[PDB]
Amino acid sequence: VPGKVTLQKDAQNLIGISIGGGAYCPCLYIVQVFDNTPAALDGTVAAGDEITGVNGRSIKGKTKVEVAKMIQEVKGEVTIHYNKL
Amino acid sequence: VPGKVTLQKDAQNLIGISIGGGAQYCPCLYIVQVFDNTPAALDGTVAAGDEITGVNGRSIKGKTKVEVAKMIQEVKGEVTIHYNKL
């Protein structure tokens, strides 16, 4: 089911997730949510979750590195658009 | 980087994993979670976010999660998992 969540960036400029996909494998997922990060303490997102945009912008046909870039550049807080596992 | 592991089922016929993917527009299947104290976990080969390409020498191409899940359920004893390492 589609949702979205705004995550604060930690002092290390992280929300605390890894990602995979974004390849003949075009969908993009959260693979890990790291303990003690803003994404782990929020509780909204989880492994399995499909990522679909990043501050109102789609990630369609972006590489995993491209989406990592996208996310890191957004400072303070970021809004991850998802479809729940 | 491709691989395959043969995992012994436990007492509940489980290897201890949860899968992702295989919808329309999202064909690829993945391991979403490895659950502690299961065969998959204690073997240590596969992990969250590895791609499942094959079970027991046949492809999972163009199957849904449910179908894959019953492909794995219905092999007793042990099951070989063909994957791509994340």
Ligand SMILES: CC(C)(C)OC(=O)N1CCC[C@H]1C(=O)N1CCC(C(=O)N[C@@H](C(=O)O)C2CCCC2)(c2ccc(Br)cc2)CC1
């Ligand atoms: C979901 C929850 C939270 C109840 O998990 C657990 O607390 N535990 C505790 C012990 C392990 C796990 C469990 O009960 N399950 C059972 C259901 C499960 C499964 O059937 N089996 C897999 C297997 O490990 O062989 C197969 C089939 C799909 C991929 C491989 C599953 C997952 C996704 C789908 Br689609 C269908 C079944 C996961 C392990």
Ligand SMILES: CC(C)(C)OC(=O)N1CCC[C@H]1C(=O)N1CCC(C(=O)N[C@H](C(=O)O)C2CCCC2)(c2ccc(Br)cc2)CC1
């Ligand atoms: C990687 C390991 C296993 C060493 O980490 C850790 O134990 N720690 C503990 C705390 C978190 C995690 C962390 O250090 N990392 C840093 C690197 C990381 C990242 O930069 N994530 C970003 C973020 O969380 O905002 C973006 C980029 C991709 C989507 C989110 C990453 C992930 C995927 C890609 Br591609 C590139 C970088 C993961 C979180």
